[PDB]
From a paper:
Tom1p is a large, 374 kDa member of a broadly conserved family of HUWE1 factors (also called Mule, Lasu, Ureb1, Arf-BP1, HectH9/E3^Histone^, Ptr1, Upl1, or Eel-1;). This family is characterized by a large N-terminal domain attached to a smaller C-terminal HECT domain (Homologous to E6-AP Carboxyl Terminus) that provides ubiquitin ligase activity ([Fig fig1]). Tom1p has been implicated in the turnover of excess levels of small, basic proteins including ribosomal components and histones. We determined cryo-EM structures of Tom1p to reveal a helical repeat solenoid architecture for the 2,888 residues preceding the C-terminal HECT domain and an overall architecture that resembles the published structures of HUWE1 but with a larger fraction of ordered residues.
We performed single-particle cryo-EM reconstructions of two Tom1p constructs: full-length Tom1p that contained a 20-residue tag including 12 histidines inserted between residues K1074-D1075 (Tom1p^His^; physiologically active in all phenotype assays) and Tom1p^ΔAD^ with the C-terminal Protein A described for intact Tom1p above ([Fig fig2], presumably inactive). These structures were determined at resolutions of 3.97 Å (Tom1p^His^) and 3.07 Å (Tom1p^ΔAD^) for the dominant closed ring conformations ([Fig fig6], 7C, S6). The two maps and structural models were very similar to each other, indicating that neither the internal affinity tag, the absence of the acidic domain, or the presence of a C-terminal Protein A scar induced notable conformational changes. Unless otherwise noted, the higher resolution Tom1p^ΔAD^ map was used for descriptions and illustrations herein. 2,792 (85%) of the 3,268 Tom1p residues were modeled into Tom1p^ΔAD^, which corresponds to 96% of the residues in Tom1p^ΔAD^ ([Fig fig6]). Beginning and end points of missing density in Tom1p^ΔAD^ structure: 214-235, 1873-2219 (region containing acidic domain), 2276-2316, 2399-2449, 2575-2589. The Tom1p acidic domain (residues 1873-2131), which is conserved in HUWE1, is found within a larger disordered region (residues 1871-2219), the ends of which are located on the inner face of the solenoid, suggesting that this unstructured component of Tom1p will at least partially occupy the basket ([Fig fig6], 6C). We therefore deleted the 259-residue acidic domain (Tom1p^ΔAD^; lacking E1873-E2131; 38% D, E, 4% K, R, pI 3.0) and found that the resulting protein no longer bound Spt6p^tSH2^ in the far-western assay ([Fig fig2]). Tom1p^ΔAD^ was expressed at the normal level in yeast and the purified protein was well-behaved ([Fig fig2]), so deletion of the acidic domain did not destabilize Tom1p but did substantially reduce the affinity for Spt6p^tSH2^. Binding was not observed with Tom1p^ΔAD^ but complexes formed normally when just the Spt6p^tSH2^ binding site was removed in Tom1p^Δ11^ ([Fig fig4]).
Residue numbers in the entry: 2 to 153, 159 to 213, 236 to 1532, 1539 to 1872, 2220 to 2276
């Protein structure tokens, strides 16, 4: 029963209505219980909820779950031993059917049926030999399935049940064959026309097996005998089937006087099973599994349901009819149902039944199956949803026929007449149906019947049969109240049509006076009839206001107005019309005047003071839309805004008197009378109640307020009648309904505190001075009443100290109010995202006037609520702690105040709902309140410390002296909290405090990630008061605590803060050293202005943010040095410091040694009373003889000059001589004094420089090699810190690099880890340009070392990767374009620039290392493979090196690594590196050249003389870097460059395309015999790996996931199967290679598992066949493995793309020659060979239809391939091949298919398909789809898978290696050195000269 808290509260109150009902059924022995159950039968009331019946269901479920065990029918899904076939005892059936027969009568007359939970005993009961039990259990299952299909528990997936249902449906067949008849349909059973076929009359059952019990063996054995005999033979897995079949045979065995009864039961069960199957199963699944086996279902169903037949069983009629009500729920079956019934003709069966229904109703001969009629109407109303069927029934005479029923007079069968009237309402939607109803005098009989019913009902009060077991407001039989409700609800739907006519028909009728009889008798007709009666009155006035006088004469409106309060009751639909009923009465000015008088607006709000009425309205959408309608009633009639307000206020002013102390929320435990635990080892009194207590929505107030604040939230939208409430309502009166005096613990979570924060946020933007100062006074006064909780001992829990008293109850109640107040405050008024200027001024005024008493209390609240969540967790068993963890609260996302100290990994999942108790609820209520009292108390302090600095406003002197005065009081309180407790025993508290300090003192990250910037001025005051001297004494105390821990290694692998002293002692040491590194980085610090802003009596005006760092570093560095003194670090090899604590101590040094351009000598204390116009002086002047504002000017002009020794121009003699007596001899006080030294002797920049020197000269950088080997996890930090140190103390870093290298050249290789770290550091240093230029000698020596030391056998050591990393750093630079120098005075002026030099490795060294790296062996290290790939991508730039790489076999060894580490996350990088290296192994000078040319010319177009060269070489950097020589060469044969400059130097670098310039000299080439030659062998390896990965399970889901099995991953993750990821990678690689490079195809074409040599290798087809047949040959298919289907489709798309890419033509220089349609014989040869296989594949798949059944899924793809081929479009493709070139692809591929003869090879496949095979539908459909495309294309001519084109991969390489697009600029001299003398000079001088020479 997963309900919302509101729905649960509504239903728990609704269930209180059926207390007499439950008590009447649950207070009986048991024989009586069944006796009462068997007397319910017919409902005389509305459809009850199932929730209120649940207790009866449980008493019944238990009774069944005990009789199930009696016969062992109880099954255990997992054990297929099956329950032994044992016929249930006769008497014991009645006991089991009196209950299962009532579960139908209950589940039909009940809604919210989804709460049913007994669908487990049903499975256990289904495995029962007896069918009657099975009949009932299947009827109930069918009803439950109907409910489910209508709704769009878990048992709808249980495959065992699915099979039981499928077999019971495929029970005795509907009709098969008889020698003297067509098929003996089931209906024939009851006609003595055909005799039952003898096949049914005997038994023959299989499981290899065959058991037969021919008749005369089924006629003597009793059912139990047969059931046992068979099971003895057959396995238990097939006992159910034997039971069903033997029962069928024995039932048909003889035409006895009883056997027929059992046949009836079996057929009924079959029908109900069909219905259930139709519900759970999918339509295609239902057709394939159920109808395929039995296609005669419908043809039989539509024969049984015929009331005219008096021989068919009355129960079979309903069951067959019920099956159709389920089947029709899917529109696909509706058409056939109507066709079978005859719903298209007017004389069919569907209309012959309707006439018999009327015949019976017109005579009442006890042959009226009112359930039959009702369900027939449901069937028709389901068939009527299919618009084609709606029209078919309309034209067949539905309405003319249905109008013969509802026109019956004085009928007593109102169950059928009410359903017919609802069917009529549903049917009539068009104008055709409406005008056909009206035309046949339909609307005149409707209103005549309504009046007749109403008139009779009132006159005959002896026919009233109201319910006696529900709470209702009528006195008439529900039958009559429903018939009238149906007539009225159709009278309403017929009024939205041409109401001008319908309203005139109403007037000339007795309807109007018969409606005043409904209104003048409400206790008779109830409220659902008054809701429909008042809806006509309001819908009749709003469409014809001229009728208002008539409605007044009849006396309706006069009665509506004079009895309005009498007409309101707890009915949701009634209450949603009252605003619309007043908006119609008000259309008449006299009506409006009467509404103003008589208080018809006071009645639209007064009902909200009643819990019963508020609960019905809910408090959600219906409640809000009742407010937005009141506002409309104010708009249309602005004359009522004076009454909607005088009523609203009178409601808000009266609620506080309706509040009562209903419940108590804290309960003492029964045993000890203590609310809370008192030890970690108490005994838990487990209960079965709800773990989370809910009291709000179950209260008379939680509904009243939840509804009222929803009305208010609706009415707040836009200005209206609510906007004027403040002008009439005091703020206090509005805050007496929100801040109740005893709310529950969940009040601040309610919707009354989520709507009233939208009402108060709307009264804020407008009335900014209305509530604020009152909300704050309420806060301050509530916190002032907790003067005994806040001001209590800090060494014990205030609550535990008085457990069992009332103060525990009378204090938690105060904190519950304080929790809603603070949630209001921090959500409405003080929000860092909403702080406006006026809000800030309001805060300043509040603190000026009321005083700083609120902050001294907010500190005490956070301090005591953190001491009570620690003293209480030190007395609670760990299970309780993980149960009562309060974080999972609405809205709140943690991420801030009080840190949660878990006991179990939160990332694991949930842990609540495994234990409960009185105590486990009394502490979940406490720890939840305590959590928001601290969470909201920390957001308040964050805002109290930002204030103006958020808006950056300009402030006055009194508006600054206060801000710096709030900052001074929030910080002296943050310190008082830290200075109070002691770490010993309160560590969990010091961890909350140190996260609170780091939260208040930081601003949110103003970016998606960003970081928490520091609040500089609060931090400055913090230091001023000694806030960092405290963090030192905390850190020198948490460092001896971290040094006496044993297992410091485990701490480095934690991801959840536990309550272990170990981890706690570490967490405080990172939340301190982190706050201490944040106040030292000018990037994490807020850039406040200079000190002069505040003081003027200073010496040096410094930037406060910059000047604060120095004092901080002078202490941090001193503490560090002291630490090194005490044998802790930079010494010892035992790693005395965890990884994270050392990460901070290293960023503490990069900052300690960063220099900020400011030399501070002394820092002045920031004091609010000493800011300029010093108040400490101005206030004193005020004390005697105020020079008001003149004193201000006096100090402003004298520059803060204290009147020296006499009154001069002011200070009258009496004013003086007093200023003398005052002004004590301490003139210092009135000036900003300098800060004192902290920790160190002097915290000035001089001392910072003097300590950094001492640290520097102690050779700690020379002591760095003594630590580095042990902390390899962080060497970049070790580098940045060291580089910063050296930069600060300018020193040649090259010297330190040499020192590192010398260590390497003497480090034994037996130290892999020291060598790894050392090489990583060396590589990191070389990565900086300012040191690279000075390391040529170092890099040469490194190359040497590598050559002499490195051996291929080291590939698996962890230092190999770093050695290759440094080598790559050297290489990338070494392979930059060879810089050329300007020559022969190229001029151009503008001195070029010249770029930095680059170390150039001697060529032999490259070769000697390459010959070492290609020779490596099997790699078991991911990082070795990654580094080798990155290095080899460089050598592959040269074809000669790529040849060696490919022939080496290195690629196989890398693919092995790729395959092995397919689960490792970073496998993507290795995948990409391998892809790039392989792509580079196929690229050749020719292909390169072609693409290089195609790139530059495409740059020259742009399509926005042009193209400044400095852009081409900065946008095509990858293009140049692939082959700079070729780029230069091609660039010189065009782009001959313009703008020679006036003198001819060359001013700018813009180039001219110069198409044809330099002539068109060109060479020729033929290719062939090279691609044919190539046989690189890479494709052999890739295909071998894929063809080997196919065998392994690339479909099976891996073992399991443990946290998101039914979550996250679900099927979302298709790469979990390790082989699939390997397969996916290989397939993507294959697509890219086969679609990019021509040589790749010839390898795919001639692939062969045995790599035998054959010049011009034979074009084998092993690969193509593998892709077509074998690759997707994994049978599986069965079951419903979502993951397997996903993987199959993914591989299908990838394989299809592979073939299309294999058939496409590679993009090349021939871009604009797309016009050419010549083709290529080789490309042709590829396509003929490929298609000719698919043809040859189809002509095998087709013949021998036997074969077709197997190759029926392969044929579904071979046809899709044909579609993609001729529509040149495949999944995941089209990123690679030019769109210009796919004109011949489609065209030529078509032309080929036509020529090949494959518009007809498809047809011959269709001409050989026995259509009986179900898949034929699919095969035929796609086969046409391919033909459609082929013809379509012919006419014109008369997911996480990223694939990228070749050049895009060059870009990838460039991105990985060169981190600068500038580098390509290096060749600029070359082009300048090249064409210019012979290009620019020549062309230009000639061009301008010849044209000039022309004239």
């Amino acid at each position: 029963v997963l309900f919302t808290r509101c729905e649960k509260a509504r239903k728990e109150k609704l269930a209180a209505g059926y207390k007499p009902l439950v008590d009447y059924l649950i207070d009986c022995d048991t024989p009586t219980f069944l006796e009462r159950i068997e007397a319910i039968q017919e409902w005389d009331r509305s459809r009850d909820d199932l929730y209120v019946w649940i207790p009866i269901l449980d008493r019944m479920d238990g009774l069944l779950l005990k009789v199930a065990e009696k016969y062992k029918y109880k099954q255990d899904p997992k054990k297929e031993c099956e329950v032994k076939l044992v016929e249930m005892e006769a008497h014991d059936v009645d006991y089991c059917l009196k209950m299962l027969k009532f579960t139908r009568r209950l589940l039909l007359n009940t809604e919210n049926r989804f709460v049913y939970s007994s669908g487990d005993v049903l499975m256990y009961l289904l495995n029962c030999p007896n069918f009657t039990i099975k009949l009932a259990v299947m009827r109930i299952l069918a009803i439950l399935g109907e409910r489910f299909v209508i709704a769009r528990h878990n048992i709808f997936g249980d495959h065992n049940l699915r099979k039981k249902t499928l077999k019971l449906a495929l029970s005795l067949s509907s009709s098969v064959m008889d020698e003297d008849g067509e098929h003996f349909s089931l209906v024939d059973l009851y006609f003595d026309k055909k005799k039952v076929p003898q096949k049914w009359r005997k038994l023959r059952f299989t499981h290899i097996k065959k058991v037969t019990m021919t008749t005369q063996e089924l006629c003597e054995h009793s059912l139990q005998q047969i059931f046992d005999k068979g099971m003895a033979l057959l396995p238990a897995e097939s006992w159910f089937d034997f039971s069903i079949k033997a029962s069928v045979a024995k039932a048909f065995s003889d035409d006895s006087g009883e056997n027929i009864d059992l046949r009836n039961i079996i057929i009924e069960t079959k029908l109900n099973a069909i219905a259930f199957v139709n519900t759970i199963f999918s339509p295609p699944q239902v057709s394939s599994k159920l109808f395929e086996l039995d296609p005669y279902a419908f043809n039989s169903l539509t024969d049984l349901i015929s009331l005219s037949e008096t021989k068919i069983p009355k129960e079979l009629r309903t069951d067959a009819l019920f099956t159709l009500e389920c089947i029709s729920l899917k529109h696909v079956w509706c058409s056939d149902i109507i066709r079978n019934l005859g719903g298209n003709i007017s004389h069919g069966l569907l209309f012959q039944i309707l006439r018999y229904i009327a015949k019976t109703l017109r005579e009442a001969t006890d042959e009226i199956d009112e359930e039959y009629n009702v369900r027939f109407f449901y069937l028709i109303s389901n068939l009527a949803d299919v618009k084609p069927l709606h029209e078919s029934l309309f034209a067949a005479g539905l309405i003319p026929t249905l109008l013969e029923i509802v026109s019956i007079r004085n009928c007593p069968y109102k169950r059928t007449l009410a359903s017919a009237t609802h069917l009529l309402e549903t049917f009539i939607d068009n104008s055709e149906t409406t005008t056909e109803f009206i035309e046949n005098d339909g609307f005149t009989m409707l209103i005549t019947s309504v009046a007749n019913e109403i008139d009779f009902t009132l006159a005959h009060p002896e026919t009233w049969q109201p319910p006696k077991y529900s709470v209702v407001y009528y006195s008439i039989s529900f039958r009559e109240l429903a018939y009238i409700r149906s007539l009225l609800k159709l009278v309403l739907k017929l009024l939205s049509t041409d109401s001008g006519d319908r309203i005139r028909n109403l007037i000339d009728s007795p309807i109007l006076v018969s409606l005043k009889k409904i209104l003048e008798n409400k206790l008779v007709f109830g409220l659902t009839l008054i809701t429909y009666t008042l809806d006509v009155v309001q819908k009749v006035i709003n469409s014809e206001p001229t009728i208002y006088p008539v409605l007044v004469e009849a006396g309706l409106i006069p009665y509506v107005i004079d009895n309005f309060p009498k007409l309101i009751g707890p009915s949701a639909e009634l209450l949603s019309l009252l605003p619309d009923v007043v908006s119609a009465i008000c259309l008449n000015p006299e009506g409006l005047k009467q509404v103003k008088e008589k208080g018809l607006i006071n009645n639209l709000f007064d009902f909200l003071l009643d819990a019963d009425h508020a609960r019905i309205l809910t408090g959600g959408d219906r409640s809000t839309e009742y407010g937005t309608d009141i506002d409309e009633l104010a708009r249309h009639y602005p004359d009522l805004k004076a009454n909607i307000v005088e009523a609203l206020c009178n409601v808000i002013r009266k609620m506080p008197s309706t509040f009562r102390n209903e419940r108590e929320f804290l309960f003492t435990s029964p045993k000890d009378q203590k609310y809370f635990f008192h030890r970690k080892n108490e005994e838990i009194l487990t209960d079965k109640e709800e773990h989370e207590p809910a009291y709000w929505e179950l209260l008379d107030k939680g509904t009243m307020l939840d509804t009222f604040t929803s009305v208010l939230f609706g009415m707040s939208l836009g200005n209206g009648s609510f906007s004027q409430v403040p002008q009439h309502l005091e703020a206090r009166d509005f805050l007496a309904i929100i801040f109740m005096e005893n709310p529950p613990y969940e009040y601040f979570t309610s919707v009354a505190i989520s709507n009233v924060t939208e009402v108060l946020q709307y009264l804020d933007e407008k009335y900014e001075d209305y509530a604020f100062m009152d909300v704050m006074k309420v806060l301050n006064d509530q916190l002032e009443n907790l003067n005994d909780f806040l001001n209590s001992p800090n060494d014990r829990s205030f609550f535990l100290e008085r457990d069992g008293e009332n103060s525990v109850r009378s204090c938690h109640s105060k904190l519950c109010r304080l929790a809603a107040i603070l949630n209001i405050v921090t959500n409405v008024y003080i929000d860092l995202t909403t702080l406006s200027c006026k809000r800030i001024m309001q805060i300043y005024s509040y603190f000026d006037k009321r005083g700083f008493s609120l902050i001294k209390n907010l500190k005490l609240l956070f301090q005591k609520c953190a001491l009570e969540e620690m003293y209480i967790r030190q007395h609670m068993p760990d299970s309780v702690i993980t149960e009562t963890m309060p974080l999972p609260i609405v809205d709140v996302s943690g991420d801030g105040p009080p840190l949660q100290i878990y006991i179990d990994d939160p990332k694991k999942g949930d842990q609540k709902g495994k234990i409960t108790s009185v105590k486990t609820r009394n502490t979940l209520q406490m720890r939840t309140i305590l959590y928001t009292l601290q969470s909201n108390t920390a957001i308040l302090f964050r805002c109290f410390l930002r204030l103006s600095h958020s808006r950056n406003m300009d402030l006055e002197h009194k508006d600054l002296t206060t801000e710096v005065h709030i900052f001074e009081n929030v910080v002296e309180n943050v310190i008082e909290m830290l200075k109070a407790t002691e770490l010993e025993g309160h560590l969990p508290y010091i961890l909350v405090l140190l996260n609170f300090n780091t939260f208040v003192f930081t601003i949110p990250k103003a970016s998606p990630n960003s970081t928490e910037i520091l609040q500089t001025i609060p931090a400055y005051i913090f230091y001023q008061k000694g806030g960092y001297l405290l963090y030192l004494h905390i850190i020198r105390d948490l460092f001896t605590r971290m040094t006496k821990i044993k297992d410091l290694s485990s701490l480095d692998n934690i991801n959840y803060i536990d309550e272990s002293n170990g981890i706690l002692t570490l967490s405080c040491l990172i939340n301190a050293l982190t706050f201490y590194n944040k106040s030292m980085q000018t990037e994490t610090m807020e850039n406040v202005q200079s000190i002069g802003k505040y003081y003027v009596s200073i010496d040096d005006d410094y930037n406060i943010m910059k000047a604060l760092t120095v004092p901080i570093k002078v202490m941090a560095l001193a503490m560090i040095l002291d630490l090194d003194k005490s044998d802790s670090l930079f010494k010892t090899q035992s790693r005395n410091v965890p990884y994270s604590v050392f990460k901070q101590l290293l960023s503490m040094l990069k900052n300690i040694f960063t220099n900020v351009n400011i030399y501070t000598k002394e820092l002045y204390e920031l004091h609010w009373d000493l800011i300029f116009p010093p108040i400490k002086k101005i206030s004193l002047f005020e004390q005697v003889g105020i020079p008001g504002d003149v004193a201000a000017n006096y100090l402003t002009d004298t520059g803060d000059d204290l009147p020296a020794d006499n009154s001069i121009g002011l200070f009258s003699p009496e004013q003086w001589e007093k200023y003398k007596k005052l002004i004590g001899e301490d003139k210092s006080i009135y000036y900003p004094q300098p800060m004192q030294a902290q920790y160190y002797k002097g915290c000035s920049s001089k001392e910072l420089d003097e300590l950094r020197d001492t640290f520097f000269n102690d050779g700690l950088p020379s002591r760095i090699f003594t630590v580095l080997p042990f902390y390899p996890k962080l060497v970049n930090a070790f580098a940045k810190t060291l580089l910063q140190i050296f930069t600060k103390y300018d020193e040649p870093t090259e010297v330190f690099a040499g020192r590192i290298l010398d260590r390497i050249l003497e480090t034994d290789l037996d130290d892999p880890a020291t060598l790894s770290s050392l090489i990583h550091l060396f590589g990191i240093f070389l990565n900086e340009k300012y040191i690279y230029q000075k390391a040529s000698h170092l890099m040469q020596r490194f190359i040497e070392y590598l050559e002499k030391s490195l051996k291929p056998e080291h590939v698996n050591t962890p230092w190999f990767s770093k050695a290759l990393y440094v080598y790559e750093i050297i290489l990338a630079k070494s392979e930059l374009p060879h810089l050329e120098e300007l020559s022969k005075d190229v001029l151009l002026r503008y001195p070029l620039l010249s770029m930095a030099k680059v170390f150039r490795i001697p060529d032999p060294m490259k070769q000697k290392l390459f010959d070492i790296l290609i020779r490596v062996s099997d790699i078991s290290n991911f990082y070795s493979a990654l580094a080798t790939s990155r290095i080899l991508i460089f050598y592959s730039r040269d074809e000669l090196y790529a040849n060696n790489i490919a022939r080496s076999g290195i690629l196989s060894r890398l693919l092995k690594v790729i395959g092995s580490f397919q689960k490792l996350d970073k496998i993507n990088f290795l995948e990409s590196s391998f892809l790039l290296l392989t792509r580079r192994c196929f690229e050749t000078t020719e292909n390169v050249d072609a693409l290089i040319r195609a790139e530059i010319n495409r740059s020259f177009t742009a399509r926005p003389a042009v193209r400044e060269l400095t852009t081409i070489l900065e946008e095509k950097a990858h293009v140049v870097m692939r082959s700079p020589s070729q780029f230069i060469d091609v660039l010189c044969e065009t782009a001959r460059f313009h703008e020679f400059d006036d003198q001819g130097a060359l001013v700018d670098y813009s180039l001219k395309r110069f198409l044809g310039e330099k002539d068109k000299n060109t060479q020729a080439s033929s290719t062939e015999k090279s691609d044919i030659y190539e046989r690189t062998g890479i494709m052999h390896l890739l295909l071998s790996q894929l063809m080997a990965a196919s065998e392994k399970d690339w479909l099976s889901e891996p073992a399991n996931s443990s946290d998101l099995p039914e979550n996250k991953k679900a099927q979302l993750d298709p790469s979990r199967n390790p082989v699939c990821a390997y397969m996916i990678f290989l397939l993507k690689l294959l697509v890219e290679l086969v679609s990019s490079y021509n040589q790749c195809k010839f390898e795919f074409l001639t692939f062969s598992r045995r790599n035998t040599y054959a010049e011009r290798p034979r074009p084998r087809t092993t690969a193509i066949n593998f892709f077509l047949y074998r690759l997707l040959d994994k049978p599986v298919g069965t079951d419903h493995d979502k993951h397997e289907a996903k993987r199959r489709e993914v591989i299908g798309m990838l394989a299809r793309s592979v073939i299309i890419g294999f058939l496409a033509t590679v993009q090349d220089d021939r871009t604009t020659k797309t016009d050419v349609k010549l083709a290529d014989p080789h490309m042709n040869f590829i396509r003929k060979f490929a298609i000719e296989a698919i043809i040859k594949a189809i002509r095998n798949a087709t013949s021998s239809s036997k074969l077709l059944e197997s190759n029926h899924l392969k044929l579904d793809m071979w046809f899709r391939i044909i579609t993609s081929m001729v529509y040149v479009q495949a999944p995941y493709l089209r990123q690679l091949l030019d769109s210009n070139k796919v004109e011949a692809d489609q065209y030529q591929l078509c032309k080929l298919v036509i020529d090949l003869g494959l518009p007809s090879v498809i047809t011959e496949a269709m001409a050989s398909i026995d259509l009986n095979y179900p898949f034929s539908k699919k095969i035929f459909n796609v086969a046409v789809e391919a033909l459609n495309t082929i013809s379509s294309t012919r006419n014109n001519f008369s997911d996480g898978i990223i694939l990228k084109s070749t050049v895009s991969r060059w870009k990838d390489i460039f991105d990985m290696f060169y981190d600068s697009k500038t580098y390509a600029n290096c060749i600029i001299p070359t082009v300048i050195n090249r064409l210019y003398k012979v290009s620019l000079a020549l062309q230009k001088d000639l061009e301008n000269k010849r044209e000039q020479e022309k004239l």
